[PDB]
Design a protein around this ligand. Structure first.
Ligand SMILES: NC(=O)c1ccc[n+]([C@@H]2O[C@H](COP(=O)([O-])OP(=O)(O)OC[C@H]3O[C@@H](n4cnc5c(N)ncnc54)[C@H](OP(=O)(O)O)[C@@H]3O)[C@@H](O)[C@H]2O)c1
Ligand SMILES: NC(=O)c1ccc[n+]([C@@H]2O[C@H](COP(=O)([O-])OP(=O)(O)OC[C@H]3O[C@@H](n4cnc5c(N)ncnc54)[C@H](OP(=O)(O)O)[C@@H]3O)[C@@H](O)[C@H]2O)c1
Lengths: 393, 393
């Protein structure tokens, strides 16, 4: 009978994704798992009606229950405001959540043998985690641009000359970064390496930006030694700093299987995951958007061919983490079974137009080559039911 | 019956590239062309023995004679210093030469019809040109870090604060850009678009850093109309800006055949590189790859090697094409084109090195009968060049 899921914060999105999102939930998740579901509706209309209140609530909920899976949501601009008569132009919910939760987002392309990688050497996937401010202005004519720092303890103020424009004009910039943000970026990155049981590489450019990127390299080591070095060995893992050039060269000549945290391939396969520093809280979401083009055709009754893998893994990565926290072996296994069924269904010849396009090039793609949105969800459901029954032994 | 090419500054390199470099001169260039050769020996040993003076001299030589063709050269690290018993870790020759000549570099993959591209639609080459100080410091913090600009003018004074630390210090920095630098980028770029008779695109992420990238979009426009519009229309060409995202996309749907200027922050034997000084006079052509050390270590052991000489060859052809262009040397200009044709033809005709046979069949499926070794391929190109030059007579 059903699996004891636990508390999970689900968040519904917009357009095409919101549609495939309902199919995932009922076909691949519900028939097998029971969840204390804290479901919030981040549909643009509802964010409007509730004055974005809902978005904040949802972030507050994730903060509490540590686990949240999200559907792609419309981030509004001029065109959207007119499209929906939006009483205002609301901020990207991801942005809202990110500020309330913090942490570092990690992306990972799931790899199928028969999927033309951007380098045929990667049989194992590579998780990347960008760090995430700029005060730029224009210099009209001759003048002096300096960057000063005034300490709050009344200490001597310090002024650096960034450039002294003696003839023409130009442009200028100011950039910053608190220690707290770098620490959070480190822990996020270390814990992520542990969960995925893989090595952690920090690429930087502290040869030039000696003081700037230097701080990064330090903050990381200081943390990696005071903490996390022991556990890293407990899994044969290690953390090592590589200059941005050694990395990129090493990575191409690499078979993947590591976490790349740098300071700075189909989308239906890409999955973004926010990892809060505490190692407790996590949000998971597809990298792609709402796929509006597909949605348009869907509305007109036309046949659509959307890839649901990115969205599916948002659930499995979320659920996986839920199990992790709760020692739920039953759930832990289900997550896997689903991820596998997904990769396997594809490595068996069943896929959507976009994936088929990878193999035979967009033009040469005939209808017989791919499955549209529905029957592909079905195919996954079938294989899922199967795989699961097989495990019962 | 030898063509007379004229004055050409040549730089010799290290390891495997030094080998094929001499093969090209002996087999493909010298037998047909006579040059007032200003040849400099940028071998790692000679640089050491001369205290990298040879490098500065070669840069001064190019600055004077307008044309320089360079062989791949070892850039020393700690392992190099120990290997060659160097008496210093000399700076990258490329860097030394750049600092002296200035200008913008343009990379371009040589395209073959029997060789796979990233976009199978790409039939015409795509030339890309990126834009290559900054004061950074550590914030003890907290405190207000502000960037101020006071016009030498003496009048106004504006202060923006990059951040006000309260949590505790971190790190900050200040960027800048001469107007000059952007103008030189523009000229260098526009000229390449004309000399290659292709449309110029400038991609940037204006949205994010409006003020910075804004100055780029403008200066380009300003200089275009003021100086370069006629020529473009004359050659049925044009220039036009785009955001990175709209660039990547309309590119994926293109056949190529355009210059691409990146303001922004496959096989290598086919990757060339040209440094275009803004004066429109001086140029340096070189392979985009290294000395191919792994291949050299094999050569040293007596093992058979298969190194792609295409990039190296095109360093000569691009160079000679520009000498001709400068001297209105019809003959030379023809030979340059003839040599580029013989190369792409030989490859499209089945004869190629191992790395290329890999692009078509993939590593694990390459047989010895699918490619030629370094010396066989060079011999093959030799035969055809002789024929091509015979038929055109
Ligand atoms: N809330 C979020 O997390 C989030 C994030 C980013 C963007 N968005 C919203 O996304 C909306 C539109 O996004 P977008 O226009 O950038 O499109 P998208 O959803 O980002 O995807 C762009 C295009 O790539 C292709 N594609 C992406 N995912 C696909 C999939 N699963 N299956 C098949 N094809 C796929 C489709 O084009 P083709 O099939 O024509 O090639 C799609 O139209 C915007 O309102 C934006 O605000 C939301
Ligand atoms: N001044 C320059 O132009 C320049 C630039 C970069 C590096 N370097 C020097 O290059 C030396 C070594 O370079 P590296 O280690 O980066 O190697 P590389 O010369 O950059 O190339 C290494 C790999 O590139 C592939 N490759 C590049 N050119 C090739 C060609 N023509 N034919 C076949 N394969 C080619 C080969 O792959 P396979 O392993 O599959 O055979 C080779 O193993 C270093 O000392 C560096 O200082 C010089």
């Amino acid at each position: 009978k059903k699996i004891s899921g636990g508390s999970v914060v689900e968040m519904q999105g917009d357009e095409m994704t919101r549609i495939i999102w309902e199919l995932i939930k009922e076909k691949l998740i519900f028939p097998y798992v029971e969840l204390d579901l804290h479901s919030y509706d981040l549909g643009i209309e509802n964010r409007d009606a509730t004055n974005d209140q809902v978005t904040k609530d949802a972030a507050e909920a994730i903060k509490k229950h540590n686990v949240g899976v999200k559907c792609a949501t419309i981030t509004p601009d001029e065109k959207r405001v007119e499209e929906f008569k939006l009483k205002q132009m609301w901020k990207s919910p991801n942005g809202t959540i990110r500020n309330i939760l913090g942490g570092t987002v990690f992306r990972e392309a799931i790899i199928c043998k028969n999927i033309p990688r951007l380098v045929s050497g990667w049989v194992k996937p590579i998780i990347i985690g960008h760090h995430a401010r700029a005060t730029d202005f224009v210099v009209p004519g001759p003048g002096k641009v300096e960057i000063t720092y005034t300490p709050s303890d009344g200490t001597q103020k310090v002024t650096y000359l960034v450039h002294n424009f003696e003839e023409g004009g130009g442009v200028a910039m100011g950039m910053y970064n608190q220690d707290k943000s770098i620490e959070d970026f480190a822990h996020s990155s270390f814990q992520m390496a542990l969960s995925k049981g893989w090595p952690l590489y920090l690429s930087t450019k502290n040869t030039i930006l000696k003081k700037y990127d230097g701080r990064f390299k330090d903050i990381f080591q200081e943390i990696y030694d005071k903490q996390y070095k022991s556990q890293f060995e407990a899994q044969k893992i290690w953390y090592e700093h590589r200059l941005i050039d050694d990395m990129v060269a090493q990575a191409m000549k690499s078979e993947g299987g590591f976490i790349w945290a740098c300071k700075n391939g189909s989308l239906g396969m890409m999955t973004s995951v926010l990892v809060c520093p505490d190692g407790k809280t996590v949000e998971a979401e597809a990298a792609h958007g709402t796929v509006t083009r597909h949605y348009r055709m869907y509305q007109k009754g036309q046949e659509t061919s959307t890839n649901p893998i990115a969205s599916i893994f948002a659930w499995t990565r979320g659920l996986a983490h839920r199990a992790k926290l709760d020692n739920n072996k039953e759930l832990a296994f289900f997550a896997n079974a689903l991820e596998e069924v997904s990769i396997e269904t594809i490595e068996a010849g069943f896929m959507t137009k976009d994936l088929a396009a990878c193999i035979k090039g967009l033009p040469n793609v005939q209808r017989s080559d791919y499955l549209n949105t529905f029957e592909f969800m079905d195919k996954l459901g079938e294989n899922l039911k199967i795989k699961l029954a097989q495990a019962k032994l």
